[PDB]
Amino acid sequence: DVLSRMISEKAALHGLLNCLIKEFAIPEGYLRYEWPDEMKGIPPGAYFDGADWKGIPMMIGLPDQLQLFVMVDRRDTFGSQHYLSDVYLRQAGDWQCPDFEPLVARLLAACEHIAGRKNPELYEQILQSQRLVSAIVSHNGRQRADAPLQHYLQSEQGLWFGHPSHPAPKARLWPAHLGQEQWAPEFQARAALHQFEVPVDGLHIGANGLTPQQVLDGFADQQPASPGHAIICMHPVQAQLFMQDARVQQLLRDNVIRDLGQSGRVASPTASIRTWFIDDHDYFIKGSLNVRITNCVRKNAWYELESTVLIDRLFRQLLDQHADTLGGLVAAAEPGVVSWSPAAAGELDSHWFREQTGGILRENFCRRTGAERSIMAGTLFARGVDLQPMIQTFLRTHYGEALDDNALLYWFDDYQTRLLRPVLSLFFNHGVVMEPHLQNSVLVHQQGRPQQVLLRDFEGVKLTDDLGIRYIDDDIHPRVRQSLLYSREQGWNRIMYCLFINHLSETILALSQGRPQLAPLMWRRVQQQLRAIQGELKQPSPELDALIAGHPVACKTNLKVRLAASYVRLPSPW
């Protein structure tokens, strides 16, 4: 419990170092792998461990007379390293090791001068995200370290620390008056979804291979509705919000719509917070929620609600027909979509409604892929309750004995074939831009042995203006078309940050913990894959050649955005 607090700070602190490094120090060149002149204030124990140094000295010149020292376990062009000491800072001066709060005060404080822009909210958010993490750790701190990985839902609920490179991972600014512990996957949160009785004339249903009626069936047991009516459901938090609107009030006071209880299915919220998982239900429920959670506000905007539909119909046309050109793609359907809005409301309203009431079903792929056989990547490669990459002990148990270097490179290599081949085939063959970061990705495994890397999330999916866009069957609202349209370098920036800096960087960092020498080998294995896959592509790919030949990699900046998205340029690992 004090231990708990201290684990949460080390995670939240390392998370923040990751932003600082990747988003400022490496791109703006404030980083040096060198010992300081004076060590006064840094205790031997911080950098010497009896035998040898605790790794490599890392130094940042934060351009305001402030200096930062930290022992890292490796040199890394992406910033992906393990921090093997506390953090120390200077002025004059003498090195010091301030508590977590003043340590955040101060790092942040410097980040602001480097970015010219300040965010007082972000600060209070950082401590919030950290405080939750304590509670989280504290609640789960007695479990087998790797239990998260044993089971799909549990891996959706063992992402104890959130975004590895994010200043406020667990911060969820909804009305504090609605709690926090009861809407957290990480507290094993469960809840019967909030429902509403609405008349069938306002329904907007998008289905693919599914009857309008079957979509409804998916979201809510349609029975309790009187005829001419239907049952939508929402996040219970969304439900309070959505009921705040003068508009809805009116609707309620006029019995145009009935507010049923939290009376829907009992589901568990997923790591994405507003998606819900019912075991052996054919679908997840991906509802909206007007709350900032990490970056954005998790509404399905009205146009996004149309586009899921098209993307699904797209992904099937392709999977059905263009198999070979997809490098092995496995994707979760988003086959059905529902929203409601008063029959006669005029579109500033109609829209507003459909985005409050928006719902999207995702195929519960655990049915195709087996509960105990599929693990959410972000968790696959996360640090468990002891700040130890869970992947290690998971594999050690699946492969009987401890795994030598070459086992680990093999493993890594089966993995990354199956993440790279589909993402990149999708991009260059079709202009379909995916968002394959750690959370948008689920590993399917035959007892350790990677089978598929399932991808999902059509919100994230965009289409390139020269290519991807062409699968758009043109009678599409100009606003919808606008949400899908990525410029091809806009788009390649995403694919780059996602596969490389968010996903594999981290996959690597997880496996090579304790064995940094594995890092560079792994990336070299990456680079061959890059070339072999290219050899296979059926369209040109200059940006790929660029990358293979070691040109710099795009990296989305989480912290800088919140302070002043912006992508910065990080040196290739090769």
Ligand X SMILES: Nc1ncnc2c1ncn2[C@@H]1O[C@H](CO)[C@@H](O)[C@H]1O
Considering only the stretches 73-81, 147-155, 236-244, 434-442, report the one whose residues sit in contact with ligand X under the rule CB under 6 A: 434-442
The response to whether 477 counts as a known ligand-binding position is no
CB of 220 to ligand X, least distance (A): 24
| 335, 340, 345, 349: CA torsion to nearest 10 | -80
Contacts of 96 (CB under 8 A, 6+ apart): 41, 88, 89, 90
Q: Is 202 in the site for ligand X (CB under 6 A)?
A: no
CB 382 within 8 A of CB 389: yes
3-state percent breakdown (helix, strand, coil) of the chain, nearest 5: 45, 20, 35
CB 21 within 8 A of CB 82: no
Q: Is 293 in the site for ligand X (CB under 6 A)?
A: yes
Residues 243-272 that bind ligand X (CB under 6 A): 271-272
The response to whether 211 counts as a known ligand-binding position is no
CB of 96 to ligand X, least distance (A): 31
Considering only the stretches 87-95, 179-187, 431-439, 483-491, report the one whose residues sit in contact with ligand X under the rule CB under 6 A: 431-439
Considering only the stretches 22-30, 157-165, 186-194, 341-349, report the one whose residues sit in contact with ligand X under the rule CB under 6 A: 157-165
Q: Is 336 in the site for ligand X (CB under 6 A)?
A: no
Q: Which backbone phi and psi does 494 adopt, to 5 degrees?
A: -55, -55
Q: Is 437 in the site for ligand X (CB under 6 A)?
A: yes
Residues 477-506 that bind ligand X (CB under 6 A): 502
Nearer to ligand X, 62 or 189 (CB): 189
The number of residues in the chain equals 574
Residue listed under structure tokens 């060590």: 39
CB of 120 to ligand X, least distance (A): 21
CB of 377 to ligand X, least distance (A): 8
Contacts of 516 (CB under 8 A, 6+ apart): 73, 74, 81
Out of 203, 234, 273, 390, point to the residue binding ligand X (CB under 6 A).
Answer: 273
Residues 158-187 that bind ligand X (CB under 6 A): 159, 162-164
CB of 407 to ligand X, least distance (A): 25
Burial of 99: CB neighbours in 10 Å, binned 0-12, 13-18, 19+: exposed
User: DSSP 3-state assignment of 525?
Assistant: helix
Beta pairing class for 462-464 and 485-486: parallel
Least Cα distance to 282 among 373, 216, 362 occurs for 362
Q: Is 383 in the site for ligand X (CB under 6 A)?
A: no
The response to whether 313 counts as a known ligand-binding position is no
The response to whether 286 counts as a known ligand-binding position is yes
Out of 18, 155, 294, 513, point to the residue binding ligand X (CB under 6 A).
Answer: 294
The response to whether 502 counts as a known ligand-binding position is yes
CB 100 within 8 A of CB 126: no
Out of 134, 155, 439, 441, point to the residue binding ligand X (CB under 6 A).
Answer: 439
Amino acid at 4: S
Tokens (6 digits) for 264: 């829907």
Q: CB atoms < 10 A from the CB of 152, how many? A: 25
CB of 333 to ligand X, least distance (A): 18
Site string for ligand X, 342-381 (x = CB under 6 A): ------------------------------------x---
The response to whether 298 counts as a known ligand-binding position is yes
- Give the distance from CA 511 to its chain's centroid: 19
C-alpha span between 48 and 477 (Å, rounded):
63
Angle between helical axes of 518-536 and 405-430 (0-180°, round to 10):
30
Considering only the stretches 53-61, 282-290, 425-433, 437-445, report the one whose residues sit in contact with ligand X under the rule CB under 6 A: 437-445
Considering only the stretches 394-402, 405-413, 436-444, 531-539, report the one whose residues sit in contact with ligand X under the rule CB under 6 A: 436-444
Angle between helical axes of 120-140 and 100-115 (0-180°, round to 10):
140
C-alpha span between 409 and 417 (Å, rounded):
12
Instruction: Using CB under 6 A, list all residues that contact ligand X.
Output: 159, 162-164, 271-273, 293-294, 378, 437-439, 502
Q: Which residues are annotated as a binding site for adenosine?
A: 502
Q: Which residues are annotated as a binding site for ATP?
A: 272, 274-275, 286, 294, 298, 362, 437, 439-440, 502
Q: Which residues are annotated as a binding site?
A: 272, 274-275, 286, 294, 298, 362, 437, 439-440, 457, 502
